[PDB]
Enzyme design. Structure first.
Site, PDB file in Angstrom:
ATOM      1  CG  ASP A   1      -2.043  -1.077   0.971  1.00 36.16           C
ATOM      2  OD1 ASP A   1      -2.481  -1.281  -0.158  1.00 36.16           O
ATOM      3  OD2 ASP A   1      -2.575  -1.654   2.071  1.00 36.16           O
ATOM      4  CB  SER A   2       3.643   2.461  -0.440  1.00 42.13           C
ATOM      5  OG  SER A   2       4.540   1.249  -0.563  1.00 42.13           O
TER       6      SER A   2
END
Ligand SMILES: [Mg+2]
Ligand SMILES: [Mg+2]
Ligand SMILES: [Zn+2]
Lengths: 147, 86, 196, 144, 210, 60, 49, 96, 769, 98
Positions: free
Chosen positions: A107-108
């Protein structure tokens, strides 16, 4: 030719009528996972972007506008009536699926420093305050001065 | 004499645990930080966490480990009588 | 770096790191990407629709027409869309090769490039921070204030104290409860224990 | 809070916005206690299920099996670049696995430079293709 | 029912009470411990007709132990609900014979006026109380029941004088445990427990009877 | 007597896919178990537990 | 409120076309919070006289 | 009243003994960085401009500790507060 | 760092090109689904014609949902195997699965081939829209696309009728996640308030906060858990002939220069009777540890967990000294035997003086001594490993060094470690689709409510269970095994009776019923002298014949039970089971003396019209033929070959499976089940905890509760060390009574005054102290 | 918000206590005051008395509004002006030939 029953009375208007406001924003909701489609309604609500036209008359504590509200390219015809192409929430950034150096883990993402300097998602934090000048007793009150 | 019984029979193996290594490294670092005579020979360092670590390998720290038994008695242990574990 | 972002497909991702244009790979003419997403984030959540927008946006960019994204159409968005992209002068599957931005060596794999519409959440990374060494302390129990609005301390949940027992740190737990929190002393009599 | 991927695995946290606290000790006797106890070089194998907690997956997993692929042959200019990337190195360039014609290296010779020459791990492999036993047991065909 | 199948119930409870005494420290012959169903109806002529005091002929008197005491009179009552009249008669057979321990098994239940004198009775006398619903099957043969070995007075004093194990430091147990009632243990003695361990092989623990 | 005899034959289920080979009795009496869907950082793996001879392992 | 103890929500067959299924918060209020479809009219009441 | 403050309903037990607040802490947003070591945690520059640590003055490095005091509180390599032996807590910002 | 830097110059992406199969293979995928649709219609066509054979154990509707389950399962597994061979190794999509991440074989078919069935709570999609699911389908249509199954994948889109069904499965895993997350802060918080009292002290014996000995040593061995590794005993050998040839060896070998190579010292001890006794007695000790091993490990699993892996420490010494089979190694025979005895003396962790303390040391490390002697044997160190004298001397100094580091550190606060050892696997997937099938029902609740109820220890569990074992002929024959089922099952009298009517029969010898006239007339031996002034109202009942052939019952066992329940003042009569139906007439037994207004008394005892209504409603409920009332009546057989149970020995010594007929009940009456015949009272266990303390006792609760928690972890997929499962049972069962250790039972405990007040009481506790 | 449809007789399952069935049905006004007025008609699950009637399972004893305990529903028919079983049976079903 091939039909098990021919006694139909009603018919749907369009198969995309089962979606809602935030559900019609994601393209092709069937090709994605069913529980992952529910997270989009929670993300689009707590997101930034323009929402009206008159930005100088409103003084809200939480207001975020975009410098260049670009409309999305790949969009659906159902959002044309909901007034979505005129008030978007971002731009059409070119996203290249790659590993780069492994810094976009869990999640980046990885962005460009030179792209931000040109106007990549530049917002303005609008916060309005207020102070009521009320009484403080019988002969006690507030006076706006410069001591 | 009615409680210390370390000069007769000892039941715990003579080896330093991970809990005793943390207190010896922490207590000695506080004493040296308050101007204390170095047991070993200094070679040129100012880190208080490194001075107490060097003295542990040389087993020259004059401290006695008093392990209190849960029954009510207690046993004594020394630095030379306890081999460090890494 | 650190702000919370999101996406239109559901794959949210914060700002991990930002490099310059020279430190990023490029195609042939000089098409530098803007957002790099983890390729393993697609099979981990079965987000197949994210690859549809990345491919449909490339075909509409070479044509110049707002393509419809109806999820219930009969235009076949598998073979007809892929064959149309190969006519303009690109690969039909949408896969392209890039070059190394540091040494200049060709990438072995094929980077699937294409535009994708994202958003921006309202979660400021610089507003959610909270740190203080020594500031205002209350008088009811000699404790810090609430939060950043009144310059206070951080919450100490019960789970942090329960796990601290498993580590066996008696001196570290005493500092978080007596030393670096509520330092105080009380004189106690010798004949009795009444604090007076 | 930039941290390593090996540290995120035991915490089971996500970089989407999961805030994590970070305290600060104010005593000399407490810093030496945490450094010798509450640390990640020591808290690897947990006694709850006699197995380590450090996990190496996601991006640091596919590149491992691809680096040891049979279709991988590094050149001469890429070996010296990876030798300097090592944090520690005695200063001994290994002998090339291929001397003629072009001095090349295999995909498993560079990966073997990090592992010291006094530790091994066999038997356990856990693959996917080929066949579960039987096959490799015929005529004794190890490897792969 | 109460015809031919009742013979197996009286034969099963007899093998259980014999193993109850041999596990303590008594010596019982192999012929009395190892027998079949057909052999039970041939040692003294069983079931000649219908209706007879079958619980009276089950009186046994064992007397084989290392401790020179022995003499344990065991009698089974005839009436279901043992009242105060049966207790006054059962307590007279132990005074003339001058036995050491008793073992009575009541079918259903007793009376509140008789249960008070069963525990007290005499300070220098111990009487055991069992039940037919618990002696029909042997609970000590289960796989989850470890080996229970009683201890003596010299074994408890030597154990507490080694690791400085205090009396309060040793775990306790209630008197309602059928395992403690299987051997007739008293309040204030340690019972050795032999539990088979998995990651060790044999685990030994000790508990006190509260 | 034959109607009540077949009551304890099929039961309520079946399973037994007969694919995996056990390495303890040179037979293929193994079943599958669709376990672990998302979990956390632990990767999903279809556990294979052999019926006879009591054997079990992991697919990956 | 008026009715509890082992009463799950899950998904009902009458939700088709009336309530958007893929529109719910990600917090603890999932399933309990309902919405409305894109094309749906709400009754206001009339007199059947 | 008096019992509610000690019973546990957000009183002197749950709200103080089982849930209070401490000092010297930081809580931001974590970011992945496999290039760092297994113990190199991220420390922001804005957070480091406030987290202090009381270090005793030793004669073995009295010259290095004096440099941070002389520079004042104008940059990162410096000192903010100082505490003497008796208890004098002198500031270096508004120091003459 | 090197691997991360190489990923930049290599590259590993994903896109549309990584999700395309073969053109010829995709044609077979859509054709295989069409072939499976014809098989479902064939079952539907054969079901409405009244000719389909139901599965023995369920009804007709429960069989249709089971037959279609294996059809759709094989349809989604056959198409997935074809897509596995089409994707080559060059595809980056397969590299994510082979590496071992968040993706397997089921994730490939759900995006290319076919998704599969979207079941809800284990069961299929129910009906909640007028016996249907969606208005787009017609009534009475059991099609696959209308019952949750998605025939398409995540590539060709989903139909509107299937998009709503697939969305139901995602909502089940999202709502339950938010509920399970809130339960983590309540279950873990309760465990740390009661388990924080016990801790590991310095004198090996685990104590608590009030100075009470709980155990004798941590982990029943006095060692740590970090050094424990999954080893392999390799002792339970099937054939005993290979066990003697592998370990035992004699000097009477062939004259062909045997016993002359490798060891250059055997030539000196040739034909030595003194050294032969030492080697012969060593094998006798190995046989003693083998026969007893069957009792210690009745399951038959040698692969256990033990610290100090001897399989790696011995092989590591072969690389340093450069040991290979092509080299003579001089090994001393006596040094191998003396080396084991010398190393065993250094394993003492307690007192060593009186002979009683030595008995507590050998049994504590009995498993470690057998594993050390079997691995470091006299022949294993010279044939499989082939070690010399210098390799064995350094090995003895390395095992003792590693054993000292494996000792548990005295002072480890295990109170917080044992509480987190149970709550950590509980946050996985405890209550998420009851996957435990096993040709049975969904007995034994497993999930969130099971852990919350076992800790609170209530009086009666939610779903009790008690497996019944059998021996004798019932362990191989099915006729004798079902004969006991008739006595154990609680067959209610209401189910036996099919019909009951009230008739008016004046003359009992000449009844009005035509079909039952000659039955009540030919019976003359019955004393019909007091039947002329009885109750004229007849209450004739009818017995179902279909129930007699299903439960195996007779007619002589019914009349003997009715008269023995209400009393002797009740007449009963029946007919043979060869007429047209099973009837049974009941009457009263009038004494004919003072039962006719003898004392007048205007009160009316019982009217004749309402007299039969009370007995008709009291016999069909209170009166029971045979069976226990509190065990329900459900039964189900489980495969004995599946679970690892019953490992008997033979004349050869191999471990074979012994199949039998086992059953499960739904009660806790352990005293009455064990008292039955044929049932084995040895391996008969149950999931209840309260009845164990009453029937067996607290000595069996420590062994029964530990096996219940081990079955939960064995099915969840995680693992729990054995040193933490034995500590939880010993902590709760320390006072000698089954009492809740949490807040519900703290006043009876003898803890400190400042500890009882921490259970949200404070004022209520400090006022008493 | 959201509420259940009133003025509609619904049959639910309530077998957790001493009851077996429950026929909850509201009775609110159109546009006047609508004082809720929920009619609670439940069915008990008790069976077996001893020596009196031994037929308690056939009872109904609904829970009428305001009312303390439960009263039978056939008593209300006596107050509505119907004192015959022929008229009361007509209110239940219009075809008593079953
Ligand atoms: Mg996370
Ligand atoms: Mg993660
Ligand atoms: Zn097998």
């Amino acid at each position: 030719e091939v039909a098990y029953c021919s006694t139909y009375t009603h018919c749907e208007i369009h198969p995309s009528m089962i979606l809602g406001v935030c559900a019609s924003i994601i393209p092709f909701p069937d090709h994605n996972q069913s529980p992952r489609n529910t997270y989009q309604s929670a993300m689009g609500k707590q997101a930034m972007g323009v929402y009206i036209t008159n930005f100088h008359v409103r003084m809200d504590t939480l207001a975020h506008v975009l410098y260049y509200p670009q409309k999305p390219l790949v969009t659906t015809r159902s959002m044309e009536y909901l007034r979505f192409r005129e008030l978007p929430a971002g731009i059409n950034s070119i996203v290249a699926i790659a590993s780069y150096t492994g810094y976009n883990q869990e999640d980046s993402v990885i962005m460009n420093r030179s792209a931000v300097d040109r106007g990549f998602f530049r917002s303005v934090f609008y916060r309005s305050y207020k102070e009521q000048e009320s009484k403080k007793g019988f002969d006690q009150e507030e006076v706006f001065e410069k001591p | 004499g009615e409680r210390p019984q370390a000069n007769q029979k000892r039941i715990t193996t003579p080896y330093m645990t991970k809990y005793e290594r943390a207190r010896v490294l922490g207590t000695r670092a506080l004493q040296i930080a308050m101007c204390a005579p170095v047991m070993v020979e200094l070679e040129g360092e100012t880190d208080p966490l490194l001075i107490a670590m060097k003295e542990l390998k040389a087993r020259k720290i004059p401290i006695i480990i008093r392990r209190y038994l849960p029954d009510g008695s207690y046993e004594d242990w020394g630095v030379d009588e306890l081999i460090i574990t890494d | 770096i650190g702000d919370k972002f999101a996406s239109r497909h559901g794959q949210k991702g914060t700002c991990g790191i930002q490099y310059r244009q020279e430190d990023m790979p490029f195609t042939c003419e000089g098409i530098t990407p803007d957002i790099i997403i983890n390729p393993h984030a697609i099979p981990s959540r079965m987000t197949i629709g994210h690859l549809i927008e990345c491919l449909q946006g490339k075909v509409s960019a070479n044509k110049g027409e707002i393509g419809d994204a109806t999820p219930f159409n009969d235009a076949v968005n598998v073979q007809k869309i892929s064959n149309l992209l190969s006519d303009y002068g690109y690969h039909l599957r949408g896969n392209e090769v890039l070059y190394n931005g540091f040494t200049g060596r060709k990438i072995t794999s094929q980077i699937f490039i294409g535009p994708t519409y994202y958003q921006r959440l309202k979660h400021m990374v610089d507003d959610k921070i909270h740190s203080r060494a020594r500031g205002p302390i209350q008088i009811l129990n000699r404790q810090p204030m609430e939060g950043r609005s009144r310059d206070g301390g951080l919450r100490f949940g019960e789970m942090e104290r329960d796990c601290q027992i498993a580590h066996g740190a008696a001196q570290f737990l005493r500092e978080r409860l007596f030393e670096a929190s509520d330092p105080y002393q009380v004189h106690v009599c010798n004949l009795c224990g009444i604090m007076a | 809070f930039r941290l390593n991927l090996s540290v995120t695995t035991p915490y089971n946290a996500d970089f989407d916005g999961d805030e994590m606290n970070l305290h600060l000790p104010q005593s000399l006797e407490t810093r030496a206690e945490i450094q010798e106890l509450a640390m990640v070089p020591r808290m690897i194998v947990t006694p709850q299920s006699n197995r380590p907690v450090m996990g190496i997956v996601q991006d640091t997993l596919t590149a491992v099996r691809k680096f040891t692929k049979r279709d991988v042959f590094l050149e001469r200019g890429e070996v010296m670049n990876l030798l300097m990337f090592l944090s520690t190195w005695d200063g001994k360039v290994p002998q090339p696995a291929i001397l003629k014609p072009r001095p090349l290296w295999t995909g498993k010779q560079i990966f073997s430079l990090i592992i010291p020459g006094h530790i091994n791990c066999i038997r356990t492999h856990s693959t996917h293709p080929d066949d579960e036993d039987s096959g490799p047991y015929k005529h004794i065909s190890p490897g792969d | 029912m109460d015809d031919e199948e009742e013979t197996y119930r009286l034969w099963k409870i007899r093998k259980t009470i014999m193993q109850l005494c041999h596990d303590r420290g008594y010596l019982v012959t192999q012929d009395e411990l190892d027998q079949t169903l057909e052999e039970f109806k041939a040692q003294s002529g069983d079931k000649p007709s219908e209706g007879r005091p079958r619980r009276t002929d089950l009186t046994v008197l064992v007397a084989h132990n290392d401790d020179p005491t022995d003499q344990m009179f065991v009698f089974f009552p005839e009436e279901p609900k043992v009242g105060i009249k049966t207790i006054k008669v059962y307590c007279q057979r132990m005074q003339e014979e001058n036995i050491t321990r008793a073992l009575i098994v009541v079918q259903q239940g007793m009376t509140p006026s008789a249960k008070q004198s069963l525990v007290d009775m005499a300070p220098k006398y111990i009487l055991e109380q069992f039940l037919q619903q618990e002696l029909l099957i042997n609970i000590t043969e289960h796989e989850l029941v470890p080996e229970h070995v009683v201890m003596t007075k010299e074994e408890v004093t030597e154990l507490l004088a080694r690791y400085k194990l205090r009396e309060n430091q040793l775990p306790r147990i209630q008197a309602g445990d059928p395992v403690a009632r299987y051997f007739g243990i008293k309040r204030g003695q340690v019972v050795k427990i032999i539990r088979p361990s998995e990651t060790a092989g044999r685990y030994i623990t000790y508990r006190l009877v509260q | 007597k034959e109607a009540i005899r077949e009551h304890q034959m099929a039961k309520t289920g079946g399973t037994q896919t007969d694919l995996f080979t056990c390495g303890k009795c040179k037979k293929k009496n193994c079943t599958y178990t669709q376990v672990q869907t998302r979990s956390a950082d632990e990767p999903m793996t279809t556990f294979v537990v052999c019926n006879e001879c009591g054997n079990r392992w992991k697919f990956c | 409120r008026d009715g509890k103890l082992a009463k799950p929500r899950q998904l009902h067959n009458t939700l088709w076309g009336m309530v958007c299924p893929a529109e719910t918060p990600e917090g603890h209020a999932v399933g309990l919070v309902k919405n409305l479809a894109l094309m749906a009219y709400i009754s206001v009441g009339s007199q059947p006289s | 009243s008096l019992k509610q403050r000690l019973k546990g309903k957000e009183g002197r037990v749950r709200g103080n003994l089982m849930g209070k607040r401490v000092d010297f802490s930081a809580r931001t947003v974590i970011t992945p960085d496999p290039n760092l070591s297994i113990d190199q945690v991220g420390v922001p520059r804005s957070i480091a401009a406030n987290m202090t640590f009381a270090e005793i003055v030793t004669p073995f490095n009295i010259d290095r500790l004096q440099e941070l005091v002389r520079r004042g509180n104008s940059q990162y390599p410096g000192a903010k507060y100082i505490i003497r032996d008796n208890g004098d807590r002198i500031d270096l910002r508004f120091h003459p | 760092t090197v691997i991360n830097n190489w990923l930049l110059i290599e590259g590993h992406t994903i896109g549309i090109g990584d999700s395309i199969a073969d053109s010829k293979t995709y044609q077979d995928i859509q054709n295989t689904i069409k072939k499976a649709k014809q098989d479902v219609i064939e079952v539907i066509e054969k079901a409405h014609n009244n000719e389909l054979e139901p599965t023995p154990g369920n009804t007709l509707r429960q069989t249709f949902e089971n037959q279609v389950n294996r059809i759709l399962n094989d349809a989604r597994d056959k198409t997935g195997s074809s897509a596995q061979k089409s994707l080559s190794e060059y595809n980056n999509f397969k590299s994510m699965v082979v590496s071992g991440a968040k993706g397997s074989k089921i994730n490939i078919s759900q995006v290319i081939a076919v998704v599969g069935q979207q079941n809800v709570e284990g069961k299929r999609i129910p009906f909640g829209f007028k016996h249907r699911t969606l208005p787009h389908f017609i009534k009475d249509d059991y099609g696959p696309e209308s019952r949750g199954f998605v025939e398409n994948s995540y590539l060709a889109g989903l139909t509107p009728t299937e998009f709503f069904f697939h969305a139901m499965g995602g909502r089940e895993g999202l709502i339950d996640t938010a509920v399970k997350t809130a339960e983590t802060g309540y279950i873990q918080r309760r465990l740390i308030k009661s388990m924080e009292s016990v801790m590991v002290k310095y004198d090996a014996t685990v104590r608590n906060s009030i100075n009470q000995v709980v155990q004798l040593r941590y982990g029943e061995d006095g060692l740590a858990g970090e050094s424990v590794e999954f080893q392999n005993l390799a002792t339970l050998k099937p054939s005993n002939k290979a066990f003697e040839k592998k370990f035992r060896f004699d000097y009477t070998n062939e004259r062909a220069l045997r016993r002359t190579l490798q060891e250059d010292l055997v030539k000196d001890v040739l034909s030595n009777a003194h050294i032969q006794n030492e080697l012969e007695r060593e094998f006798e000790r190995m046989r003693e540890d083998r026969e007893v091993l069957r009792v210690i490990f009745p399951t038959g699993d040698s692969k256990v967990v033990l610290p100090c892996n001897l399989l790696r420490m011995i092989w590591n010494a072969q690389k340093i000294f450069h040991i290979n089979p092509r080299l003579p190694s001089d090994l001393h025979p006596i040094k191998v035997v003396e080396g084991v005895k010398e190393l065993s003396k250094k394993l003492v962790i307690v007192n060593g003086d009186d002979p009683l303390s030595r008995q507590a040391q050998e049994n504590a490390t009995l498993l470690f001594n057998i594993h050390l002697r079997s691995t470091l044997c006299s022949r294993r160190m010279a044939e499989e490993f082939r070690l010399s004298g210098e390799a064995f001397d350094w090995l003895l100094g390395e095992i003792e060094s590693k054993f000292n580091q494996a000792i548990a550190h005295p002072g480890e606060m295990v109170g917080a470690l044992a509480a987190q050892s149970l709550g950590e696997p509980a946050t996985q997937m405890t209550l998420n689709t009851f996957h435990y099938a096993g040709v049975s029902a969904k007995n034994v609740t497993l999930g969130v409510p099971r852990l919350k109820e076992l800790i609170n220890i209530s009086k009666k569990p939610k779903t009790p269970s008690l497996t019944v074992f059998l021996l004798g002929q019932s362990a191989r024959d099915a006729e004798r095994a079902k004969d006991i089922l008739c006595r154990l099952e609680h067959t209610t009298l209401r189910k036996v009776t099919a019909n009951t009517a009230i008739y008016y029969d004046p003359n009992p010898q000449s009844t009005v019923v035509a079909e039952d006239q000659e039955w009540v007339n030919v019976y003359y031996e019955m004393p019909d002298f007091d039947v002329a002034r009885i109750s004229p109202w007849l209450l004739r009942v009818e017995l179902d014949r279909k129930h007699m052939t299903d439960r195996k019952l007779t007619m002589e066992q019914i009349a003997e039970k009715i008269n023995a329940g209400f009393g002797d003042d009740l007449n009963c009569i029946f007919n043979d089971d060869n007429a047209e139906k099973l009837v049974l007439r009941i009457r009263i037994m009038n004494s004919d003396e003072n039962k006719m207004q003898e004392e007048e008394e205007v009160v009316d005892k019982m009217d004749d019209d309402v007299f039969l209504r009370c007995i008709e409603s009291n016999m069909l409920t209170d009166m029971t033929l045979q069976g226990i009332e509190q065990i329900s009546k459900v039964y189900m057989h489980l495969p004995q070959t599946d679970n690892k149970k019953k490992i008997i020995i033979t004349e050869d010594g191999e471990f074979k499976a012994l199949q039998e007929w086992i059953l499960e009940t739904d009660g806790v009456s352990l005293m009455r089940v064990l008292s039955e015949k044929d049932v084995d009272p040895v391996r008969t266990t149950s999931n209840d905890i309260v009845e164990i303390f009453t029937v067996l006792g607290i000595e069996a609760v420590r062994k029964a509760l530990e096996r219940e928690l081990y079955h939960v972890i064995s099915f969840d997929g995680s693992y729990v060390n054995y040193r933490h499962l034995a500590l939880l049972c010993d902590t709760m069962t320390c006072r000698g009574h089954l009492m809740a250790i949490t807040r519900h039972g703290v006043n009876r405990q003898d803890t400190g005054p400042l500890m009882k007040c921490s259970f949200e009481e404070t004022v209520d506790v400090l006022m008493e102290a | 918000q959201e509420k259940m449809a009133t003025n509609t007789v619904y049959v639910f399952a309530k077998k957790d206590s001493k009851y077996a069935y429950t026929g909850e049905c509201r009775s609110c006004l159109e546009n006047s005051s609508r004082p809720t007025s929920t009619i609670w008609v439940s069915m008990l699950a008790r069976g077996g008395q001893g020596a009196k009637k031994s037929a308690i399972g056939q009872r109904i004893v609904a829970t009428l509004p305001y009312i303390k305990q439960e009263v039978p529903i056939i008593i209300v028919f006596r107050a509505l002006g119907f004192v015959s079983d022929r008229d009361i049976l007509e209110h239940i079903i219009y075809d008593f030939e079953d």
